[PDB]
């Protein structure tokens, strides 16, 4: 038995968070949940939310409405990695059918320091900050996720030919970890090369690491091949073993209290969360059960979209998860 800090959130957030705790009860998931809210106060977070994760080290997060809350949890535990595994979904028909790639998105440094400077009356300068530190760390974490997930090839997206000092140092430490971890295959490829190759044949890709700016854009892009943020898992990792497994889609307030949602992403954020703590067997019975419910093509919800209610899509998974 293990405890997880959970948060309901806005919109369908609570309506889908309980659809997960009901299927994890049906999956025999050794999880006792722990419900905290996190609404911004004063700036910082609720202290009863601040404590809840300092002990649990894991957490499932949902849709949040509108400084940013995603910036707060970032620096609250020094979230230094935004991970996003995008995988093809048989049944869900998208013109990209053979996809299986995990975007690693460094989340600390880059131009996301917000540091801008008016220089004269009409000249604005935004700062891109890059340290050796946050690079070598997102370099080791990438190799540890590749090893601990049977991943074949790890590519470091960059434009070091251009920013010969900025992206060059990023790449310099990308290689230094590769010799000290020749375990997994390692190669490089220019951003624009990846951007073209991504829309021609994504299959040739496997694992990708990049600095923050390229990461935020590549993350939502790679997801766009499979269907959108509603089917996209998401996992942020921070210092001292803390980890967050959010969804990324919008709150969708127009049908929040309607049971007209698709939570599967939040589930695969938990199936991701399951797989982070070594729950392969219990994440293998949940993941393939949700795959088969969509692959059957009967209980899909409206943004997919068939004709059912979020509970029906939730009830069929509970019927297909009670079996092995």
């Amino acid at each position: 038995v293990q405890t997880v800090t959970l948060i309901p959130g806005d919109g369908i957030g609570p309506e889908i968070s309980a659809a997960v705790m009901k299927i994890f009860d049906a999956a025999k998931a050794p999880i006792q949940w722990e419900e905290r809210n996190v609404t911004a106060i004063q700036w910082m977070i609720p202290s009863e939310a601040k404590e809840s994760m300092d002990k649990n080290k894991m957490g499932l997060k949902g849709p949040l409405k509108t400084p940013s809350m995603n910036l707060l949890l970032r620096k609250t535990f020094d979230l230094y990695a935004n991970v996003r595994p995008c995988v093809s979904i048989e049944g869900y028909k998208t013109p990209y059918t053979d996809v299986n790639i995990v975007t690693i998105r460094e989340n600390t440094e880059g131009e996301y320091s917000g540091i801008e400077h008016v220089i004269v009356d009409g000249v604005v300068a935004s700062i891109k900050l890059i340290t050796e530190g946050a690079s070598k760390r997102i370099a080791e974490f990438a190799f540890e996720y590749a090893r601990n997930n049977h991943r074949s090839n790890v590519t470091a997206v960059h434009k070091a030919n251009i920013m010969r000092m900025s992206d060059g140092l990023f790449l310099q430490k990308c290689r230094e970890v590769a010799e000290s971890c020749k375990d997994i295959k390692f190669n490089e490829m220019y951003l624009d090369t990846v951007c073209l190759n991504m829309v021609q044949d994504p299959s040739q890709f496997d694992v990708l690491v990049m600095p923050n700016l390229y990461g935020d854009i590549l993350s939502d892009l790679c997801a766009g091949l499979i269907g959108g943020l509603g089917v996209t898992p998401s996992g942020n990792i921070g210092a001292n073993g803390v980890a967050i497994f959010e969804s990324v889609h919008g709150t969708a307030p127009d049908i929040a209290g309607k049971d007209m949602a698709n939570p599967t992403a939040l589930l695969l954020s938990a199936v991701m969360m399951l797989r982070h703590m070594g729950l392969f067997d219990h994440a293998a019975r949940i993941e393939a059960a949700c795959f088969a419910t969509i692959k059957d093509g009967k209980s899909l919800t409206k943004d997919l979209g068939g004709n059912a209610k979020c509970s029906d899509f939730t009830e069929e998974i509970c019927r297909r998860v009670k079996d092995l």
Binding site: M163, L196, D220
Partner: protein, 347 residues
Amino acid sequence: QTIPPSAKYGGRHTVTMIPGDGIGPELMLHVKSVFRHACVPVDFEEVHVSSNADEEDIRNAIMAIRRNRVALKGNIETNHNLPPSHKSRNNILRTSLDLYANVIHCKSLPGVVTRHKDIDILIVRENTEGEYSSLEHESVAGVVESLKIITKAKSLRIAEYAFKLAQESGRKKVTAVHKANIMKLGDGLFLQCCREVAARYPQITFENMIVDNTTMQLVSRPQQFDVMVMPNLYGNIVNNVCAGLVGGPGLVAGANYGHVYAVFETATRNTGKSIANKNIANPTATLLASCMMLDHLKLHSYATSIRKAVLASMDNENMHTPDIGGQGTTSEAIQDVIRHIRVINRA
């Protein structure tokens, strides 16, 4: 300065042309041959460009471009960077020419089947102020600062170009691309730069969009886009992606405009140094570059009869080049387009 007027002596406009490195020359000769069969009153001023002596001679090679306000070029291999001091051969030209706007035209091809169909997009971006910042000093070791720059002035000049493009062409939607949600001031400046001109063309609907969701929106329903515009940093993304949607680098015409000067370049900047004189290279982009080069000389009648041809030859499966998934050779394509090219208006 001492600059004269570019003039057109009795018919033939005199256009500057640069062969380049790799695939450049072997294509240009077909573009010549295509024209020469099409009886196009455009004479060509060859100028050997670079990778042979990129020191001071090319510069005497700038002059020909500064003369005739319109040039067409292939590509130049990147400098070894041994100098490692800017010196982008291609870039230098667009600097000393004040070529601020960079324009590509990703259109779907009825003969080139892709994951998505019915696509028509015009992309706009700057060059010397659209971020893409150099500089990057090391404050202390292990710490590097990069300095993306927005200028309000060049932001409106590229903005006005985005809308002067839409009205003359009968477009309907300009869509800004930005990350103002992260760099509130830099990209918000560009955003309010767009909003100012957006009110001067009220007939043209205006919309903004975050660079993130915009990329997602392309691979799903790209037909919604009509005209897109961003600073030069986000372009490399949107360009190469919109390039691969309708095919590959060898299918996208390109163009770098100045306040007066106008240069035509391919949508994809690929040297092709590995496909040297293989009779393989896809011409369909380079040809399309000549198409809009004729459209800029206000000779549409020939750019239209050329354009309908190259779409025409491409639709038969056999003419595709290897780089897009075919089995044919350029010589067959060029001639098949020439076949497709009938004697409109000659003998």
